[PDB]
Unconditional design. Structure first.
Lengths: 336, 290, 290, 290, 284, 285
C-alpha cells in the first residue's frame, strides 16, 4: 500500500485553490501539516487585523442609538418605561467567516490523532476569541460565502477549512474526531490532479493561453437535435498556443504506480475529443496523457492516427521544485 | 364559478389542484411551497372562488407578509390619535367577524411570502386558535389587549388559510417550527413538461418541436439544479412564468424572443447561482442558445 | 423629446437602449447592473424623457437607497407631530396618487444603489404588486398601517421602475431570488469600444492614434480582470467615467493628463484590486504610461 | 491666507501639494492616505485656507468619524428635543446651507478617520450627489425624512470634502469601489529625505552628519517594510511625527535623545510588526543606535 | 516614593514622559500595583493629595461612547442629551486651568478603544489641545458649539498584558499613547525591605525572590504563547499581612493554593504535571 | 449547622478566611450540592446572628440588566419615575449598620453578562476600591449631589455551576474580581453518613451506597474533554425524602435512581443507552 509522501500533497492543494516552510514540522501525516498551516495561518490574519463587518442591531435600549424605528417603538409602548427601538451598527468580528475559524478549531482540537504542540497552541487561540460564537458547521455555510467579499487571504484558510471538515470522521469516541484516509481513494485524488493542473497551467504557462473547452459532437440525429443521450464531453484542460494546440487528460491510478499491464482506459476519451474538435486556426493538434508515478518519470511519443500524442509520467516523491521544473520541461516538448 | 374558466388555462396537473382541495376542506391551513414563477399567487385567487363556488371579493382577503408586519396590525393593536391611543381591530380579526355572520359560506385568507416574518410575532396567541381541530366557540380565548377577559375571539371553523412560501433562499433550510405543525406543505412543480403549458404556446403560433426542445433544456437544466443540495436544492429551480409573460401582443415565440429572456433574466441569474465556476455559466448559456 | 436629443453624446450602443424599452414596456421593472462610471445615473434621467416623450420632471422621481430606508419611509410610516405621532403616506404612495391621477402619461420612480438595502423589508406588500400582471384595481391590497375602513393600494399600469445595482460589492448583491424575478436585468458594458465614445475626445482636439492607443490598453486590463473570478470578477472592470470629465476648459487629452489619471485614481485602485504582488501593479500601471 | 505660510513648516514637497490642489479643484472630493504621523490632520486645516485663500474657520468644518456615527446625526433624522421629537438637520446638511448663501467662496468639510465608520450608511443619498458633475439643483434629491418629493436636497458646487484614512489597518479600508471613484486618492509618504524636514532639525541646532545619518536609517528601514507587501505594505511604514514633536523645550537632537524616543515608542511598535523574529527586532533597533 | 516597589528610574522616566507627551499606557500583568502606581503618581503631579481632580474608571466591552462623552438618555419627563463623564471632566479641569487634572483608565484592552473615544482619538494628542483644534461632536445640534481638550489634562491608562485579543490592533492610538511596561519588582530591595520591615526572615525573603523569579522566567520562556506580560505580580503578598501576621511558609503556601493555583491553571491549561511541578516547587 | 453541613469542615472554615479578606467569592460546582443552602448557613455563620434580613438573594438571567439590578425608570400611571433596584436598596440598607456584615446572593451568575448589568459599579465591588473615596455618579443620576459607593461591610457571593459542557471558558471579567472555589459532592464525608446513620440506615447499606456513588463519580470524571471533574453528581437528592418522616431503604433509593440520576446520567452522556443502562442497572444492584 504505497502512497505519495504527504508533505508534497499540500502543494497540490495550493494550485487547486489558487492561493511557507514545511521542513520545520516533524509530523509526516497530513493533519499535522494542515493543522500547522491553519494554526500559523490564523496568526498572520490577526497581526494585520481580522475582518470586521458592520452588523445592524435592532434592540430595546435605555436611550437613542442611531435611527429609532417609530413603528416598533409605539407598538411596544417602550417610551413609557424609558426604552426605544433603534437600529444601529455594532462593529464585530462575529461574521460567518470568522465563526467558521473558531468552530473549525474545535474540530481540529477534537481530532483524536494529532501532534501535542498543535492541539495546545490552538486551545489558547480558541480562548483568545471570546466574543465570537461557536457554530455547528455544514457545507451550506461555506456555500453562502462564495461571494468572497473578504480578502484573498481569508479565502485561503477557509478553503483549507472546507477540506478539513469534509475530511473529518468520528473515531474511537463519540466526541473526538478522526482524519479521513484521503490518499487511498483515487477519485478525490483524481479530481485534485485535474484541478491541480488546470489552475497551475494558468500560473506558469503565461506564454500559452489555457482554457477548459466544451465540445459538441459532429453527429446529426433525425430523432433529436438535443443528443441528450450522447455523452457530455468536456475537456479536462486545453492549453492553446499560436503554433500548436494541446488537449490533456490526466488521472490518478493505483495500478500505474506499480511498475505489467498498463491502465490507459482514459485514452479512449482523448482521441474522440480530437476528432470532434476542429481547429479554425488549423495550426496543429496534439495530445497528452500524464499520470502520477512514484519512483521515476518516463516520456513517450506516438503517431497514432495522424495525431502526435505523448504518454508521460512524473516522479512524485522526488522534490517539489524539480517537479515544478519537470512539468515545464514536459509541456515545452509537446507544446511545440 | 365554473371550473372550465378556472382550471383550463392553468398549467398544473389536475392531480395537484384536487389534492389541494382535499386537505383544504379537511385541515383548512395549507401551504404551497415552491420556487417563484409557478403561479403560487396565481392559483390561490382562483381557488378561493372555486371553494365558495362564486366570484365574491368580500369573502376572500389577500395579504403579503414582511418583516414589519406585526400582531398589532394583523389582529388587534393601538394606533395613536393626535395624542391619545385608540385600540383598533386588525384585518384578520375584522376578516373573521364577517365570516361569523354567514357561517355556511367559506372564507379565505391569503398570505404571500410568509417566511419573511416570524409567525409567532404576528399571529402569536392566535396560533392556538388557528389550528384546525381547536376551532369554534369552545376554544375561545380573551385577547392580550382586551379591556376585560369577557371579550373573546375564536377562529370560526369556516375560515381556511392559504400561505405562499418560496424555497428560493438558503436561510429556509431552518424552517420555522410553527409552520410545520400547523400547515400542510405542498410542493409545486416548475411545470415545463406539462400538456397545458405546451398547448398555450402552440395556441400562440409556436412550433411544437422547438417547444419540446425548449422543455428538454429546462427539464435538463432544472435537474442540474436539483442534484446539488449545498448551494442550490430542488426548490431553487426555474419557474415557468418567464415564458408565459410578454406574448399578449401575439408575438410568436422564437430564438430572438428566447434570447431576450436569456440575456435579461436567466443568464445573470445563473451568474449568481454558479459564481465559483464562470465556465459553468458558459456551459449552459451556449447550450440554451443553440 | 426623442431619441435623437438624448443619444447625441451618450456612449451606449443604440441596441441596448431600444432593447431596454423592449423589456421595460412589457415587464415594467428593470435593473441596470454595471460597475461605477458607466452612466447608470446619467442615462436614467434621460430615459424618463423618452417614454413620456417630453422633458418633464414632475412625472419623474429619483431616490437612493442607503441601507437605512424603511417601509415607514417608502410607503407608510408614523412621524412625530408636536406631541404625538401621526400616519404619513410615504413618497411612493404619494407618487402613485399623482400617477394614477392620469393613467395616460407614464410615471417613473428611480432608485440608485438599489442593491444595498434589504429590499424585502422596504417594499413589503409591493413585492407582489410591482409586477406587470398584478396591477390595477383587480389586485388592490390593504397595507400594514392602513385604516380599518377598507382602503387598498394598487400599482397603476403607467408606473415603470428602474434600478441601479452596482456590480462592485458582491455581498451587497440580490440573493433574494424571489425578488430577482420581478426585475429584468440589463447588463451595461464599460462603453470603450464604441466610436461614439471616440468622437467625444476627437471633437475635443484629440489625436485618433492617442485615442486608439488608450482604448487598446483598457480592454487588455479588463481582459486581465475578466480572466480572474476569485476576487475580481468580470463586473469589476473599469468604467469610462474617469476619462469623461476634466476636459471642459479646453485642455486637450495627452499623456500628461493620462498620467495624472493613472497615478492619482487608478493606481490606488489597482493595488487594492490585486493586493497580492506589487509586480502585477507596476507592469499594468507602466503600460498605460508607455 | 497665502501659500508660503503653509510651506514653511511643512515637510511634504510642494509638487505633491500642487497635485493636491489641482485634483481638488477638479474632482471636488479627495482622500489623503498614509501611515499615521505624516501630518494628514496637520495639512488639512492648512490646505483649506490655501484653497479659499483666506483664514476663515466659519467656512471650514472639521469632524472625526467613528463606528457610532450615522446618517441620522450626519444628514437628517428624528431626535428628541424634549417631550416632543423633532427632525434635526445634521451638521453636513447645515454646512451646505451656509455655503449656499455664499456660492463664490469655497466651503470645506473635513473628515478625519473616515475609513472607520460605515460610509455607505452615513453618506447614503450624498454618495451620488457629491460628484463634481452632479452638484446643483438639476440633480435635486428627496431625503428619507423629507415631508414630500418636493422637498429636495442638492449639494452646492462650491463644496470640497477632504477625508483622512490611515493605511495601517487592512480591516478598515474603503473597499466600496463605487465610493472609491468619487474620491481621488493621494498617497502621502513620511518625507524623511526632504530639505524642509532636515532644515527644521538643523534650525533646531542639530548636527548635519547625525541628521543625514538618521535619514538613511529611516529611509532604509521603511524600504524593508514596504518590500514585504504580503505582511506589510508601504502604507504601514513609520511616519516622521515621533521625531517632530517633543523638542519644543530647546533640547538639541543628540543621539542620546534619539536613543530615548526609540526605546519608549518605536521599540514595542516594531515588536508587533515583527512578532515572530526577535532577531529582526533586535537587528533594526541596533541599527538605529549604531 | 517610600512604599513603592518599582525602581526610582521608572517613576522618574514616567513623569518626564508624561509631562511632555501628556498620554501614557502602563501595561503589565495583574498584581504589580498599577492602581497604586497611578493613584500615587497622580498625587505627585498635582503636588497635593487631592482626589477630586482625579477620576478613575474601569472599561469593559459594553462601555460605549454614549456613556463616556455624550449621549441621549431619558430624564423622568423624556429624552435629553446627557453629558458623559469625560465631557463633564474636561469641563471641570477647564474650570481651573492652572492645576493638573487626571483621568485614569482601567481595563483598557477589553473595549474597542477607537469606538469609545471616537472624536477625541485625535484631540487627545498634546499638540492638538486647544480651541483651534475644537470640533463639534456627533450629537451636537449645531456646528458652532465644539469640544476641545485643554492642555492641562493628562491621561493614564492601565492595561493587562495577560489577555491578548486577536481582534483589533490599532497602531494609530499607539502614536497617541507612550507605552510603559512595569515589571513585578521582586528583585527590588524596596519590596524586600518592606518584608524585612515586617519582621520577615532574611533567608525566607531571599528564598522567596528566587522562587518567583524562576517561575517568572519560565513564563517569559516561550515568547510565542506567553511572555513577560503574563508573569506574576507581587501585590498578593502586600495584602493580608498588615494585621500583624508576619510572613511564614504556611502563609505563603496558603497563597499558593489560594491565588497562584488558578493562575497556573489559567496559564498552563491542560498541563497538570507542569502545574503540579511548579506548584510543588514553591512549597519545597 | 456545622455538623448539619455535609461538606468537609476544612472547606467551611477555609472560606471565611478567604471571604473576610477578599470580600468577593464564587463557588462553582455540580448541581445538588446545597449551594443555596450552603451560602445561607455560611452567611448566617459570618454574621453569627442567623438573620435572613441581612442577606438578600437574586437569580440572574440573560435579560437581567442594570435597570433591574441597580436603577432605572419605571412607568407611573402617567409618565415614569426612577425606581431603586435591589443592589442600590440593599447597600443603602447596610450603610446604616457599618459593623454588620451584609451578604448578597447572585444565582446563576455565569449566564448573565456581569458587565451589562453592573456597568460603572463593576470596579467598585472589587475590595481594593471601596468606600466614599471611590464614589461615582450613576448613569441616570443627573445631579452630582449624591454618588453610589458600596461600603466595606458588603460581601458578595456568586453561585455558579460546572454542570454544563456547553459552557465555554469563564468570562475574563469574573476571573479578576472573584476567588474560585470548587465544592466536592461529599459522599465520602462522615457528616453525610451520620446524616444517614442517624436515620437508622444500615452501615453496610450506608457504606455500600457511598462506595456505589464514588465509583460512578470517578468514572464520569475519567473523560478528559466532554465530562470533567465538575460533572460528578452531588448529594442533595439524598436529603430529599428522608426527614419528612420516611425512613431510608433500597426501594426508596430505587425511586431516586429513576427520579433524577437516570435522566441526569442521560444528560451527561446523551449518546449511549447501554453505558447508561450499565450504570443505571448497576446502581440498583
Ligand atoms: N396563464 C397562466 N399563467 C400562469 C400560470 N401559472 C403561473 N402563471 C403566471 O405566472 C405569473 C406569476 O405567477 P405568480 O403566482 O405570481 O408566481 P409567484 O409564486 O407568486 N411568484 P413569487 O414566488 O415570486 O411570489 C403570472 O402571469 C401568472 O398568471 C398558469 O398556469 N397559466
Ligand atoms: N458625456 C457623457 N458622460 C458620460 C457618459 N457616460 C457616463 N458619463 C459620465 O460619467 C459620470 C458618472 O456617470 P454615472 O451615471 O453616475 O455612473 P453611475 O453608474 O451612475 N455611478 P455609480 O455606479 O457610482 O452610482 C458622469 O460624468 C456621467 O455623465 C456618456 O455617455 N456621455
Ligand atoms: N511642526 C510640524 N509638525 C508636523 C508636520 N507634519 C506633521 N506634523 C505633526 O505630526 C503630528 C500628527 O499630525 P497628523 O496629521 O495627525 O498625522 P496623521 O497621519 O493624520 N496621524 P493619523 O493618521 O493617525 O491621524 C502633529 O504633531 C503634527 O503637527 C510638519 O510638517 N511640521
Ligand atoms: N506597599 C506597596 N503596596 C503595593 C505595591 N504594589 C501594589 N500594592 C498594593 O497591592 C494592592 C492591590 O493592587 P492592584 O492595583 O489591585 O493590583 P494591579 O491593579 O493588578 O496592579 C493595593 O493595596 C496596592 O496598593 C507596592 O509596590 N508597594
Ligand atoms: N439539612 C441539610 N440540608 C441540606 C444540606 N445540604 C443540602 N441540603 C438540602 O438540599 C436542598 C438544596 O440543594 P441545592 O443544590 O441548593 O438545589 P439546587 O440549587 O437546585 O441545585 C435543600 O433541601 C437543602 O436543605 C445539609 O447539609 N443539611
Ligand atoms: Mg408571489
Ligand atoms: Mg451612479
Ligand atoms: Mg493624524
Amino acid at each position: 500500500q504505497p502512497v505519495i509522501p504527504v508533505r508534497n500533497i499540500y502543494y497540490m492543494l495550493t494550485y487547486a485553490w489558487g492561493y511557507a516552510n514545511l521542513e520545520a514540522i516533524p509530523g509526516n501525516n497530513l493533519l499535522d501539516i494542515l493543522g500547522y498551516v491553519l494554526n500559523k495561518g490564523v496568526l498572520q490574519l490577526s497581526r494585520r487585523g481580522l475582518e470586521l463587518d458592520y452588523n445592524p442591531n435592532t434592540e430595546i435600549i435605555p436611550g437613542i442609538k442611531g435611527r429609532i424605528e417609530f413603528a416598533k417603538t409605539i407598538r411596544g409602548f417602550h417610551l413609557n418605561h424609558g426604552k426605544t427601538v433603534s437600529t444601529f451598527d455594532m462593529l464585530n468580528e462575529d461574521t460567518l467567516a470568522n465563526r467558521i475559524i473558531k468552530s473549525t478549531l474545535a474540530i481540529l482540537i477534537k481530532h483524536e490523532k494529532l501532534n501535542s504542540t498543535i492541539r495546545d497552541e490552538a486551545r489558547s487561540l480558541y480562548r483568545k476569541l471570546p466574543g465570537i460564537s461557536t457554530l455547528h458547521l455544514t457545507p451550506q455555510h461555506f456555500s453562502y460565502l462564495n461571494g468572497g467579499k473578504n480578502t484573498r487571504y481569508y479565502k485561503f484558510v477557509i478553503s483549507v477549512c472546507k477540506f478539513i471538515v469534509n475530511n473529518s470522521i468520528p473515531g474511537q469516541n463519540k466526541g473526538h474526531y478522526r482524519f479521513y484516509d484521503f490518499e487511498r481513494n483515487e477519485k478525490e485524488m483524481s479530481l485534485l490532479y485535474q484541478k491541480f493542473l488546470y489552475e497551475f497551467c494558468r500560473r506558469e504557462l503565461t506564454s500559452a493561453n489555457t482554457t477548459r473547452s466544451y465540445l459538441k459532437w459532429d453527429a446529426s440525429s433525425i430523432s433529436d437535435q438535443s443528443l441528450n443521450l450522447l455523452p457530455r464531453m468536456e475537456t479536462d484542460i486545453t492549453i492553446r498556443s499560436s503554433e500548436k494546440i494541446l488537449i490533456v487528460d490526466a488521472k490518478y491510478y493505483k495500478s500505474i504506480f506499480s511498475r505489467e499491464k498498463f491502465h490507459s482506459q482514459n485514452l479512449y476519451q482523448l482521441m474522440n475529443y480530437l476528432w470532434s474538435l476542429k481547429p479554425e486556426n488549423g495550426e496543429n493538434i496534439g495530445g497528452l496523457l500524464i499520470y502520477p508515478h512514484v519512483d521515476t518519470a518516463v516520456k513517450h511519443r506516438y503517431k497514432i492516427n495522424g495525431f502526435d500524442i505523448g504518454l508521460c509520467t512524473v516522479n512524485l516523491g522526488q522534490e517539489w521544485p524539480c517537479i515544478h521544473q519537470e512539468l515545464l520541461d514536459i509541456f515545452d516538448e509537446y507544446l511545440k | 364559478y365554473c371550473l372550465e374558466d378556472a382550471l383550463n388555462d392553468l398549467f398544473i396537473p389536475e392531480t395537484t389542484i384536487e389534492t389541494i382541495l382535499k386537505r383544504l376542506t379537511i385541515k383548512k391551513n395549507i401551504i404551497l411551497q415552491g420556487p417563484p414563477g409557478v403561479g403560487k399567487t396565481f392559483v390561490a385567487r382562483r381557488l378561493a372562488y372555486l371553494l365558495t363556488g362564486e366570484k365574491a371579493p368580500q369573502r376572500v382577503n389577500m395579504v403579503q407578509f414582511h418583516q414589519s408586519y406585526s400582531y398589532e396590525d394583523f389582529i388587534q393593536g393601538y394606533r395613536p390619535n393626535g395624542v391619545g391611543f385608540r385600540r383598533k381591530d386588525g384585518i384578520f380579526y375584522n376578516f373573521c367577524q364577517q365570516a361569523k355572520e354567514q357561517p355556511e359560506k367559506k372564507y379565505i385568507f391569503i398570505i404571500d411570502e410568509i417566511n419573511r416574518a416570524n409567525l409567532s410575532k404576528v399571529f402569536g396567541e392566535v396560533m392556538m386558535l388557528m389550528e384546525h381541530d381547536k376551532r369554534g366557540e369552545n376554544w375561545s380565548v380573551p385577547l392580550t389587549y382586551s379591556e376585560n377577559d369577557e371579550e373573546r375571539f375564536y377562529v370560526p371553523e369556516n375560515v381556511y388559510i392559504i400561505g405562499l412560501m418560496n424555497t428560493a433562499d438558503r436561510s429556509l433550510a431552518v424552517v420555522d417550527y410553527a409552520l410545520r405543525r400547523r400547515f400542510s406543505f405542498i410542493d409545486i412543480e416548475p411545470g415545463f413538461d406539462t400538456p397545458q403549458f405546451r398547448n398555450f404556446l402552440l395556441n400562440k403560433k409556436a412550433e411544437p418541436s422547438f417547444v419540446e426542445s425548449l422543455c428538454q433544456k429546462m427539464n435538463e437544466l432544472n435537474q442540474e439544479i436539483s442534484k446539488e443540495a449545498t448551494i442550490l436544492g430542488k426548490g431553487f429551480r426555474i419557474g415557468h412564468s418567464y415564458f408565459c409573460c410578454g406574448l399578449e401582443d401575439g408575438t410568436s415565440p422564437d430564438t430572438q424572443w428566447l434570447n431576450e429572456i436569456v440575456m435579461t433574466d436567466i443568464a445573470p441569474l445563473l451568474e449568481e447561482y454558479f459564481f465559483d465556476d464562470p465556465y459553468k455559466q458558459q456551459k449552459w448559456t451556449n447550450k440554451l442558445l443553440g
